[PDB]
Amino acid sequence: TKNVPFKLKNAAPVIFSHDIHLKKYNNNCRICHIALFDLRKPKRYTMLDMEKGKSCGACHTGMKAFSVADDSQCVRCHSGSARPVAYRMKGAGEAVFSHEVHVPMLEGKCRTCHSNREITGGRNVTMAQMEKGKSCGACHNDKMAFTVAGNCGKCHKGM
Ligand code: HEC
Ligand code: HEC
Ligand code: HEC
Ligand code: HEC
Ligand code: HEC
Ligand code: HEC
């Protein structure tokens, strides 16, 4: 009712709850209204934007409330990681990214990717660009993880 849902394409929504913030600021709506949240035609701020001080990040910095830049504090807002993301493109079977595989493999880290503009800042990145270190390529280069230059079947289906 007073809980606002922030829907995400590949994960459960993050739910902003007024109750706990009101008990915190003593119903002073002025703290967050028409200053922090214009709530008129907002974009979908990214976590990096929040790290810059936008959205929830205007407070969740570590000083006032837990920071949005803490791998151990993501659970404070997000329930989990996400559901398996399926990538579609012409020329190969669906490429699938799973967290069940990766997170437990990176000691539970999250910002390694989510706060890495070279790993998340793209849209329909190609294998060429992955080779130059973009997206999956930032780690699948035979140093960190198996190279993206080959191993097609390890990521793509029907291969
Ligand atoms: C052998 C070297 C491979 C072939 C042939 C292809 N891949 Fe990949 N791949 C993966 C993902 C998650 C994506 C999508 C990323 C995004 O869209 O942002 C891709 C994309 C492609 C594409 C489309 C772009 C292009 O034409 O270059 C094709 C046709 C494609 N891939 C063919 C993931 C991975 C990966 C996991 C680390 C590996 C090893 C490969 N891809 C290997 C090949
Ligand atoms: C790189 C190896 C990653 C690590 C480590 C973590 N995540 Fe992840 N996550 C990654 C990808 C490839 C994707 C899809 C990217 C996209 O275009 O959306 C995701 C997705 C999520 C999401 C969904 C975001 C959305 O739907 O808008 C969330 C909420 C998310 N990831 C959270 C998350 C957490 C909490 C992690 C630590 C336990 C974590 N991810 C690690 C890549 C990577
Ligand atoms: C910061 C901690 C907040 C305080 C204090 C209050 N509100 Fe708020 N409100 C806040 C956010 C992050 C949002 C989500 C806006 C968005 O961009 O999606 C909201 C939303 C509302 C709404 C709209 C509800 C909806 O349509 O989902 C209303 C009607 C609203 N807020 C009222 C309200 C009142 C009256 C407050 C004091 C009693 C108040 N808010 C405080 C953030 C915060
Ligand atoms: C509550 C203060 C949050 C904490 C702490 C974390 N996230 Fe978050 N995340 C939150 C919201 C409200 C939203 C949507 C904001 C909007 O305007 O739409 C999100 C969104 C993300 C996304 C998608 C966008 C992006 O940056 O890629 C992801 C992938 C996500 N959040 C991941 C994430 C991680 C890994 C966190 C820990 C470092 C993290 N979030 C903490 C609110 C909050
Ligand atoms: C400052 C003006 C705030 C803004 C903007 C947002 N939050 Fe916040 N949050 C703030 C404080 C000072 C606290 C209180 C202390 C506590 O630990 O409870 C919080 C707390 C939360 C919590 C924790 C709730 C709990 O059960 O303890 C969550 C999950 C949270 N905040 C989420 C959240 C989101 C998603 C916001 C942006 C959409 C957001 N907060 C903004 C102060 C402020
Ligand atoms: C570094 C943070 C990574 C990024 C970015 C992505 N992956 Fe990854 N991947 C990484 C590691 C550490 C490992 C371990 C490899 C090993 O065997 O030592 C992996 C593993 C995978 C796998 C193998 C899964 C399994 O067989 O259980 C796949 C299929 C895979 N990774 C796919 C993948 C895709 C599609 C990515 C981009 C969206 C991606 N990974 C990013 C580290 C990292």
Side-chain angles (χ1 to χ4, degrees), residues 8-12 71 74 78 80-82 85 87 97 99 102-103 106 108-114 119-120 139:
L8 297 171
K9 183 179 182 178
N10 313 305
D71 292 325
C74 302
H78 298 275
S81 305
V85 169
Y87 291 78
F97 179 81
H99 283 76
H102 295 78
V103 174
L106 304 154
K109 298 178 176 179
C110 310
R111 294 182 59 240
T112 317
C113 306
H114 293 290
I119 297 188
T120 182
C139 311

PDB file of all heavy atoms in Angstrom, residues 8-12 71 74 78 80-82 85 87 97 99 102-103 106 108-114 119-120 139, ligand 2:
ATOM      1  N   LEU A   8      12.167  -5.101 -12.049  1.00  0.00           N
ATOM      2  CA  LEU A   8      13.398  -5.378 -12.775  1.00  0.00           C
ATOM      3  C   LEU A   8      13.127  -6.486 -13.803  1.00  0.00           C
ATOM      4  O   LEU A   8      12.339  -7.400 -13.558  1.00  0.00           O
ATOM      5  CB  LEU A   8      14.491  -5.811 -11.796  1.00  0.00           C
ATOM      6  CG  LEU A   8      14.897  -4.747 -10.773  1.00  0.00           C
ATOM      7  CD1 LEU A   8      15.820  -5.348  -9.726  1.00  0.00           C
ATOM      8  CD2 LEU A   8      15.575  -3.597 -11.480  1.00  0.00           C
ATOM      9  N   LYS A   9      13.780  -6.404 -14.954  1.00  0.00           N
ATOM     10  CA  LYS A   9      13.568  -7.387 -16.005  1.00  0.00           C
ATOM     11  C   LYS A   9      13.974  -8.815 -15.666  1.00  0.00           C
ATOM     12  O   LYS A   9      13.270  -9.759 -16.021  1.00  0.00           O
ATOM     13  CB  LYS A   9      14.300  -6.948 -17.275  1.00  0.00           C
ATOM     14  CG  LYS A   9      14.109  -7.862 -18.469  1.00  0.00           C
ATOM     15  CD  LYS A   9      14.848  -7.311 -19.675  1.00  0.00           C
ATOM     16  CE  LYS A   9      14.642  -8.175 -20.903  1.00  0.00           C
ATOM     17  NZ  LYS A   9      15.325  -7.595 -22.092  1.00  0.00           N
ATOM     18  N   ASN A  10      15.097  -8.982 -14.974  1.00  0.00           N
ATOM     19  CA  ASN A  10      15.589 -10.317 -14.656  1.00  0.00           C
ATOM     20  C   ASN A  10      15.574 -10.699 -13.191  1.00  0.00           C
ATOM     21  O   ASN A  10      16.190 -11.691 -12.803  1.00  0.00           O
ATOM     22  CB  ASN A  10      17.015 -10.463 -15.176  1.00  0.00           C
ATOM     23  CG  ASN A  10      17.162  -9.978 -16.596  1.00  0.00           C
ATOM     24  OD1 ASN A  10      16.444 -10.426 -17.486  1.00  0.00           O
ATOM     25  ND2 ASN A  10      18.094  -9.055 -16.818  1.00  0.00           N
ATOM     26  N   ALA A  11      14.881  -9.932 -12.365  1.00  0.00           N
ATOM     27  CA  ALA A  11      14.867 -10.264 -10.951  1.00  0.00           C
ATOM     28  C   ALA A  11      13.627  -9.747 -10.268  1.00  0.00           C
ATOM     29  O   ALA A  11      12.881  -8.953 -10.840  1.00  0.00           O
ATOM     30  CB  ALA A  11      16.109  -9.687 -10.274  1.00  0.00           C
ATOM     31  N   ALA A  12      13.411 -10.209  -9.043  1.00  0.00           N
ATOM     32  CA  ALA A  12      12.275  -9.769  -8.261  1.00  0.00           C
ATOM     33  C   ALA A  12      12.440  -8.270  -8.095  1.00  0.00           C
ATOM     34  O   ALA A  12      13.540  -7.743  -8.259  1.00  0.00           O
ATOM     35  CB  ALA A  12      12.286 -10.443  -6.924  1.00  0.00           C
ATOM     36  N   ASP A  71      28.931  -5.315  -1.236  1.00  0.00           N
ATOM     37  CA  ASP A  71      28.527  -6.637  -1.662  1.00  0.00           C
ATOM     38  C   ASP A  71      27.748  -7.358  -0.563  1.00  0.00           C
ATOM     39  O   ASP A  71      26.905  -8.206  -0.851  1.00  0.00           O
ATOM     40  CB  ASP A  71      29.751  -7.464  -2.060  1.00  0.00           C
ATOM     41  CG  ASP A  71      30.418  -6.949  -3.319  1.00  0.00           C
ATOM     42  OD1 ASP A  71      29.694  -6.466  -4.217  1.00  0.00           O
ATOM     43  OD2 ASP A  71      31.662  -7.046  -3.418  1.00  0.00           O
ATOM     44  N   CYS A  74      23.777  -5.904  -0.359  1.00  0.00           N
ATOM     45  CA  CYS A  74      22.815  -5.996  -1.444  1.00  0.00           C
ATOM     46  C   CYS A  74      21.590  -6.712  -0.923  1.00  0.00           C
ATOM     47  O   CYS A  74      20.463  -6.335  -1.228  1.00  0.00           O
ATOM     48  CB  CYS A  74      23.394  -6.773  -2.620  1.00  0.00           C
ATOM     49  SG  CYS A  74      24.915  -6.052  -3.297  1.00  0.00           S
ATOM     50  N   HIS A  78      17.770  -6.230  -2.239  1.00  0.00           N
ATOM     51  CA  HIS A  78      17.470  -7.307  -3.178  1.00  0.00           C
ATOM     52  C   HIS A  78      17.349  -8.643  -2.448  1.00  0.00           C
ATOM     53  O   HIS A  78      18.166  -8.952  -1.586  1.00  0.00           O
ATOM     54  CB  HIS A  78      18.581  -7.389  -4.217  1.00  0.00           C
ATOM     55  CG  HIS A  78      18.721  -6.150  -5.039  1.00  0.00           C
ATOM     56  ND1 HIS A  78      17.982  -5.887  -6.169  1.00  0.00           N
ATOM     57  CD2 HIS A  78      19.514  -5.066  -4.862  1.00  0.00           C
ATOM     58  CE1 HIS A  78      18.344  -4.683  -6.628  1.00  0.00           C
ATOM     59  NE2 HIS A  78      19.272  -4.150  -5.865  1.00  0.00           N
ATOM     60  N   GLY A  80      17.551 -11.800  -3.788  1.00  0.00           N
ATOM     61  CA  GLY A  80      18.633 -12.656  -4.237  1.00  0.00           C
ATOM     62  C   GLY A  80      19.426 -12.004  -5.356  1.00  0.00           C
ATOM     63  O   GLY A  80      19.597 -10.788  -5.382  1.00  0.00           O
ATOM     64  N   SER A  81      19.919 -12.823  -6.278  1.00  0.00           N
ATOM     65  CA  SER A  81      20.689 -12.332  -7.419  1.00  0.00           C
ATOM     66  C   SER A  81      19.711 -12.066  -8.548  1.00  0.00           C
ATOM     67  O   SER A  81      19.339 -10.927  -8.812  1.00  0.00           O
ATOM     68  CB  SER A  81      21.698 -13.385  -7.877  1.00  0.00           C
ATOM     69  OG  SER A  81      22.543 -13.790  -6.815  1.00  0.00           O
ATOM     70  N   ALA A  82      19.291 -13.142  -9.199  1.00  0.00           N
ATOM     71  CA  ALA A  82      18.352 -13.065 -10.305  1.00  0.00           C
ATOM     72  C   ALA A  82      18.020 -14.478 -10.774  1.00  0.00           C
ATOM     73  O   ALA A  82      18.481 -15.463 -10.193  1.00  0.00           O
ATOM     74  CB  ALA A  82      18.966 -12.265 -11.451  1.00  0.00           C
ATOM     75  N   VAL A  85      19.419 -15.628 -16.929  1.00  0.00           N
ATOM     76  CA  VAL A  85      19.187 -14.719 -18.045  1.00  0.00           C
ATOM     77  C   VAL A  85      19.526 -15.386 -19.383  1.00  0.00           C
ATOM     78  O   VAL A  85      20.640 -15.870 -19.590  1.00  0.00           O
ATOM     79  CB  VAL A  85      20.020 -13.430 -17.895  1.00  0.00           C
ATOM     80  CG1 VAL A  85      19.986 -12.629 -19.181  1.00  0.00           C
ATOM     81  CG2 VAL A  85      19.467 -12.591 -16.769  1.00  0.00           C
ATOM     82  N   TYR A  87      20.145 -15.124 -23.366  1.00  0.00           N
ATOM     83  CA  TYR A  87      20.528 -14.181 -24.408  1.00  0.00           C
ATOM     84  C   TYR A  87      20.212 -14.788 -25.772  1.00  0.00           C
ATOM     85  O   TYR A  87      20.557 -15.945 -26.048  1.00  0.00           O
ATOM     86  CB  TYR A  87      22.023 -13.865 -24.336  1.00  0.00           C
ATOM     87  CG  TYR A  87      22.441 -13.074 -23.129  1.00  0.00           C
ATOM     88  CD1 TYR A  87      22.577 -13.684 -21.882  1.00  0.00           C
ATOM     89  CD2 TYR A  87      22.710 -11.709 -23.232  1.00  0.00           C
ATOM     90  CE1 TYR A  87      22.978 -12.959 -20.773  1.00  0.00           C
ATOM     91  CE2 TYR A  87      23.106 -10.974 -22.124  1.00  0.00           C
ATOM     92  CZ  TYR A  87      23.238 -11.608 -20.904  1.00  0.00           C
ATOM     93  OH  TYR A  87      23.646 -10.890 -19.818  1.00  0.00           O
ATOM     94  N   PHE A  97      23.251 -16.917 -18.833  1.00  0.00           N
ATOM     95  CA  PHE A  97      24.059 -16.524 -17.691  1.00  0.00           C
ATOM     96  C   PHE A  97      23.349 -16.892 -16.391  1.00  0.00           C
ATOM     97  O   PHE A  97      22.186 -16.562 -16.188  1.00  0.00           O
ATOM     98  CB  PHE A  97      24.335 -15.026 -17.661  1.00  0.00           C
ATOM     99  CG  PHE A  97      25.150 -14.611 -16.473  1.00  0.00           C
ATOM    100  CD1 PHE A  97      26.529 -14.759 -16.478  1.00  0.00           C
ATOM    101  CD2 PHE A  97      24.532 -14.181 -15.308  1.00  0.00           C
ATOM    102  CE1 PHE A  97      27.280 -14.484 -15.345  1.00  0.00           C
ATOM    103  CE2 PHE A  97      25.280 -13.904 -14.167  1.00  0.00           C
ATOM    104  CZ  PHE A  97      26.658 -14.063 -14.188  1.00  0.00           C
ATOM    105  N   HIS A  99      23.678 -17.107 -11.956  1.00  0.00           N
ATOM    106  CA  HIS A  99      24.376 -16.608 -10.778  1.00  0.00           C
ATOM    107  C   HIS A  99      24.716 -17.788  -9.879  1.00  0.00           C
ATOM    108  O   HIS A  99      25.678 -17.740  -9.115  1.00  0.00           O
ATOM    109  CB  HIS A  99      23.508 -15.618 -10.004  1.00  0.00           C
ATOM    110  CG  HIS A  99      23.432 -14.257 -10.621  1.00  0.00           C
ATOM    111  ND1 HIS A  99      22.673 -13.951 -11.727  1.00  0.00           N
ATOM    112  CD2 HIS A  99      24.035 -13.098 -10.261  1.00  0.00           C
ATOM    113  CE1 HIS A  99      22.838 -12.644 -11.987  1.00  0.00           C
ATOM    114  NE2 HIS A  99      23.658 -12.080 -11.125  1.00  0.00           N
ATOM    115  N   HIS A 102      28.111 -18.406 -11.081  1.00  0.00           N
ATOM    116  CA  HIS A 102      29.080 -17.349 -10.827  1.00  0.00           C
ATOM    117  C   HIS A 102      29.318 -16.775  -9.448  1.00  0.00           C
ATOM    118  O   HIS A 102      30.466 -16.670  -9.014  1.00  0.00           O
ATOM    119  CB  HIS A 102      28.822 -16.198 -11.781  1.00  0.00           C
ATOM    120  CG  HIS A 102      29.065 -16.560 -13.206  1.00  0.00           C
ATOM    121  ND1 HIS A 102      28.185 -17.286 -13.975  1.00  0.00           N
ATOM    122  CD2 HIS A 102      30.158 -16.359 -13.983  1.00  0.00           C
ATOM    123  CE1 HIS A 102      28.761 -17.500 -15.162  1.00  0.00           C
ATOM    124  NE2 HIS A 102      29.961 -16.954 -15.213  1.00  0.00           N
ATOM    125  N   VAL A 103      28.257 -16.370  -8.765  1.00  0.00           N
ATOM    126  CA  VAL A 103      28.420 -15.770  -7.451  1.00  0.00           C
ATOM    127  C   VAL A 103      29.172 -16.686  -6.493  1.00  0.00           C
ATOM    128  O   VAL A 103      30.170 -16.287  -5.897  1.00  0.00           O
ATOM    129  CB  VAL A 103      27.061 -15.378  -6.869  1.00  0.00           C
ATOM    130  CG1 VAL A 103      27.225 -14.893  -5.437  1.00  0.00           C
ATOM    131  CG2 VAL A 103      26.437 -14.292  -7.740  1.00  0.00           C
ATOM    132  N   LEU A 106      32.731 -16.490  -7.173  1.00  0.00           N
ATOM    133  CA  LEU A 106      33.453 -15.257  -6.915  1.00  0.00           C
ATOM    134  C   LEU A 106      33.353 -14.870  -5.449  1.00  0.00           C
ATOM    135  O   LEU A 106      33.304 -13.690  -5.101  1.00  0.00           O
ATOM    136  CB  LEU A 106      32.901 -14.153  -7.807  1.00  0.00           C
ATOM    137  CG  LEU A 106      32.975 -14.564  -9.285  1.00  0.00           C
ATOM    138  CD1 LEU A 106      31.908 -13.831 -10.087  1.00  0.00           C
ATOM    139  CD2 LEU A 106      34.379 -14.297  -9.829  1.00  0.00           C
ATOM    140  N   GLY A 108      31.026 -14.779  -3.578  1.00  0.00           N
ATOM    141  CA  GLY A 108      29.852 -13.979  -3.283  1.00  0.00           C
ATOM    142  C   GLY A 108      29.885 -12.529  -3.736  1.00  0.00           C
ATOM    143  O   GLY A 108      28.947 -11.788  -3.467  1.00  0.00           O
ATOM    144  N   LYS A 109      30.945 -12.111  -4.422  1.00  0.00           N
ATOM    145  CA  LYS A 109      31.052 -10.728  -4.888  1.00  0.00           C
ATOM    146  C   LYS A 109      29.920 -10.382  -5.852  1.00  0.00           C
ATOM    147  O   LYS A 109      29.339 -11.274  -6.460  1.00  0.00           O
ATOM    148  CB  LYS A 109      32.396 -10.510  -5.579  1.00  0.00           C
ATOM    149  CG  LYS A 109      33.615 -10.724  -4.685  1.00  0.00           C
ATOM    150  CD  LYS A 109      34.901 -10.522  -5.485  1.00  0.00           C
ATOM    151  CE  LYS A 109      36.139 -10.641  -4.611  1.00  0.00           C
ATOM    152  NZ  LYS A 109      37.380 -10.458  -5.416  1.00  0.00           N
ATOM    153  N   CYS A 110      29.601  -9.095  -5.987  1.00  0.00           N
ATOM    154  CA  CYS A 110      28.528  -8.672  -6.888  1.00  0.00           C
ATOM    155  C   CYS A 110      28.924  -7.454  -7.690  1.00  0.00           C
ATOM    156  O   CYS A 110      28.646  -7.372  -8.884  1.00  0.00           O
ATOM    157  CB  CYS A 110      27.258  -8.306  -6.119  1.00  0.00           C
ATOM    158  SG  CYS A 110      26.670  -9.512  -4.896  1.00  0.00           S
ATOM    159  N   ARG A 111      29.553  -6.493  -7.027  1.00  0.00           N
ATOM    160  CA  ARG A 111      29.947  -5.275  -7.704  1.00  0.00           C
ATOM    161  C   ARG A 111      31.039  -5.501  -8.745  1.00  0.00           C
ATOM    162  O   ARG A 111      31.274  -4.633  -9.591  1.00  0.00           O
ATOM    163  CB  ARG A 111      30.385  -4.224  -6.684  1.00  0.00           C
ATOM    164  CG  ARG A 111      29.251  -3.751  -5.791  1.00  0.00           C
ATOM    165  CD  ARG A 111      29.691  -2.672  -4.830  1.00  0.00           C
ATOM    166  NE  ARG A 111      30.207  -1.505  -5.538  1.00  0.00           N
ATOM    167  CZ  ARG A 111      31.443  -1.039  -5.395  1.00  0.00           C
ATOM    168  NH1 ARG A 111      32.292  -1.643  -4.566  1.00  0.00           N
ATOM    169  NH2 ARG A 111      31.827   0.034  -6.077  1.00  0.00           N
ATOM    170  N   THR A 112      31.685  -6.669  -8.690  1.00  0.00           N
ATOM    171  CA  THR A 112      32.741  -7.015  -9.643  1.00  0.00           C
ATOM    172  C   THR A 112      32.211  -6.831 -11.057  1.00  0.00           C
ATOM    173  O   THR A 112      32.940  -6.431 -11.968  1.00  0.00           O
ATOM    174  CB  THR A 112      33.186  -8.493  -9.549  1.00  0.00           C
ATOM    175  OG1 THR A 112      33.324  -8.893  -8.183  1.00  0.00           O
ATOM    176  CG2 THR A 112      34.519  -8.661 -10.236  1.00  0.00           C
ATOM    177  N   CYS A 113      30.933  -7.140 -11.233  1.00  0.00           N
ATOM    178  CA  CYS A 113      30.313  -7.004 -12.533  1.00  0.00           C
ATOM    179  C   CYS A 113      29.414  -5.785 -12.551  1.00  0.00           C
ATOM    180  O   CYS A 113      29.595  -4.870 -13.350  1.00  0.00           O
ATOM    181  CB  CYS A 113      29.482  -8.246 -12.859  1.00  0.00           C
ATOM    182  SG  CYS A 113      30.384  -9.823 -12.751  1.00  0.00           S
ATOM    183  N   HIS A 114      28.449  -5.774 -11.643  1.00  0.00           N
ATOM    184  CA  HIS A 114      27.484  -4.692 -11.569  1.00  0.00           C
ATOM    185  C   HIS A 114      28.036  -3.277 -11.408  1.00  0.00           C
ATOM    186  O   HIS A 114      27.361  -2.312 -11.761  1.00  0.00           O
ATOM    187  CB  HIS A 114      26.472  -5.033 -10.486  1.00  0.00           C
ATOM    188  CG  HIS A 114      25.620  -6.208 -10.841  1.00  0.00           C
ATOM    189  ND1 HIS A 114      24.653  -6.184 -11.818  1.00  0.00           N
ATOM    190  CD2 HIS A 114      25.653  -7.487 -10.393  1.00  0.00           C
ATOM    191  CE1 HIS A 114      24.149  -7.416 -11.929  1.00  0.00           C
ATOM    192  NE2 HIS A 114      24.723  -8.246 -11.084  1.00  0.00           N
ATOM    193  N   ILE A 119      31.894  -4.433 -17.861  1.00  0.00           N
ATOM    194  CA  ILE A 119      31.196  -5.707 -17.787  1.00  0.00           C
ATOM    195  C   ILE A 119      29.680  -5.595 -17.928  1.00  0.00           C
ATOM    196  O   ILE A 119      29.020  -6.543 -18.363  1.00  0.00           O
ATOM    197  CB  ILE A 119      31.490  -6.430 -16.451  1.00  0.00           C
ATOM    198  CG1 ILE A 119      32.978  -6.769 -16.348  1.00  0.00           C
ATOM    199  CG2 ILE A 119      30.670  -7.702 -16.348  1.00  0.00           C
ATOM    200  CD1 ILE A 119      33.321  -7.651 -15.168  1.00  0.00           C
ATOM    201  N   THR A 120      29.113  -4.446 -17.582  1.00  0.00           N
ATOM    202  CA  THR A 120      27.663  -4.312 -17.657  1.00  0.00           C
ATOM    203  C   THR A 120      27.110  -3.189 -18.522  1.00  0.00           C
ATOM    204  O   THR A 120      25.924  -3.192 -18.859  1.00  0.00           O
ATOM    205  CB  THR A 120      27.066  -4.148 -16.250  1.00  0.00           C
ATOM    206  OG1 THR A 120      25.639  -4.075 -16.350  1.00  0.00           O
ATOM    207  CG2 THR A 120      27.588  -2.873 -15.589  1.00  0.00           C
ATOM    208  N   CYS A 139      36.368 -11.458 -18.099  1.00  0.00           N
ATOM    209  CA  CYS A 139      36.888 -12.560 -17.283  1.00  0.00           C
ATOM    210  C   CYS A 139      37.124 -13.845 -18.052  1.00  0.00           C
ATOM    211  O   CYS A 139      37.883 -14.700 -17.608  1.00  0.00           O
ATOM    212  CB  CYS A 139      35.937 -12.901 -16.147  1.00  0.00           C
ATOM    213  SG  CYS A 139      35.355 -11.493 -15.164  1.00  0.00           S
TER     214      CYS A 139
HETATM  215  C1  HEC B   2      29.284 -11.183 -13.180  1.00  0.00           C
HETATM  216  C2  HEC B   2      30.066 -12.495 -13.121  1.00  0.00           C
HETATM  217  C3  HEC B   2      28.163 -11.021 -12.148  1.00  0.00           C
HETATM  218  C4  HEC B   2      28.249 -11.182 -10.816  1.00  0.00           C
HETATM  219  C5  HEC B   2      29.486 -11.588 -10.058  1.00  0.00           C
HETATM  220  C6  HEC B   2      26.930 -10.912 -10.263  1.00  0.00           C
HETATM  221  N1  HEC B   2      26.043 -10.599 -11.281  1.00  0.00           N
HETATM  222 FE1  HEC B   2      24.138 -10.136 -11.124  1.00  0.00          FE
HETATM  223  N2  HEC B   2      23.923 -10.166 -13.107  1.00  0.00           N
HETATM  224  C7  HEC B   2      24.914 -10.402 -14.037  1.00  0.00           C
HETATM  225  C8  HEC B   2      24.362 -10.466 -15.388  1.00  0.00           C
HETATM  226  C9  HEC B   2      25.037 -10.990 -16.651  1.00  0.00           C
HETATM  227  C10 HEC B   2      23.063 -10.107 -15.294  1.00  0.00           C
HETATM  228  C11 HEC B   2      22.128  -9.699 -16.414  1.00  0.00           C
HETATM  229  C12 HEC B   2      22.541  -8.307 -16.828  1.00  0.00           C
HETATM  230  C13 HEC B   2      21.385  -7.496 -17.365  1.00  0.00           C
HETATM  231  O1  HEC B   2      21.470  -7.040 -18.536  1.00  0.00           O
HETATM  232  O2  HEC B   2      20.396  -7.316 -16.607  1.00  0.00           O
HETATM  233  C14 HEC B   2      22.783  -9.966 -13.883  1.00  0.00           C
HETATM  234  C15 HEC B   2      21.570  -9.597 -13.370  1.00  0.00           C
HETATM  235  C16 HEC B   2      21.353  -9.276 -12.042  1.00  0.00           C
HETATM  236  C17 HEC B   2      20.175  -8.566 -11.579  1.00  0.00           C
HETATM  237  C18 HEC B   2      19.006  -8.184 -12.463  1.00  0.00           C
HETATM  238  C19 HEC B   2      19.096  -6.754 -12.927  1.00  0.00           C
HETATM  239  C20 HEC B   2      17.888  -6.348 -13.744  1.00  0.00           C
HETATM  240  O3  HEC B   2      17.062  -7.231 -14.063  1.00  0.00           O
HETATM  241  O4  HEC B   2      17.760  -5.151 -14.075  1.00  0.00           O
HETATM  242  C21 HEC B   2      20.338  -8.286 -10.257  1.00  0.00           C
HETATM  243  C22 HEC B   2      19.301  -7.685  -9.315  1.00  0.00           C
HETATM  244  C23 HEC B   2      21.665  -8.798  -9.912  1.00  0.00           C
HETATM  245  N3  HEC B   2      22.297  -9.370 -11.030  1.00  0.00           N
HETATM  246  C24 HEC B   2      22.162  -8.878  -8.605  1.00  0.00           C
HETATM  247  C25 HEC B   2      23.369  -9.496  -8.261  1.00  0.00           C
HETATM  248  C26 HEC B   2      23.797  -9.723  -6.900  1.00  0.00           C
HETATM  249  C27 HEC B   2      23.027  -9.326  -5.668  1.00  0.00           C
HETATM  250  C28 HEC B   2      25.012 -10.358  -6.960  1.00  0.00           C
HETATM  251  C29 HEC B   2      25.855 -10.858  -5.784  1.00  0.00           C
HETATM  252  C30 HEC B   2      25.280 -12.015  -4.989  1.00  0.00           C
HETATM  253  C31 HEC B   2      25.353 -10.477  -8.375  1.00  0.00           C
HETATM  254  N4  HEC B   2      24.311 -10.008  -9.168  1.00  0.00           N
HETATM  255  C32 HEC B   2      26.592 -10.891  -8.884  1.00  0.00           C
HETATM  256  C33 HEC B   2      26.267 -10.550 -13.715  1.00  0.00           C
HETATM  257  C34 HEC B   2      26.791 -10.669 -12.434  1.00  0.00           C
END
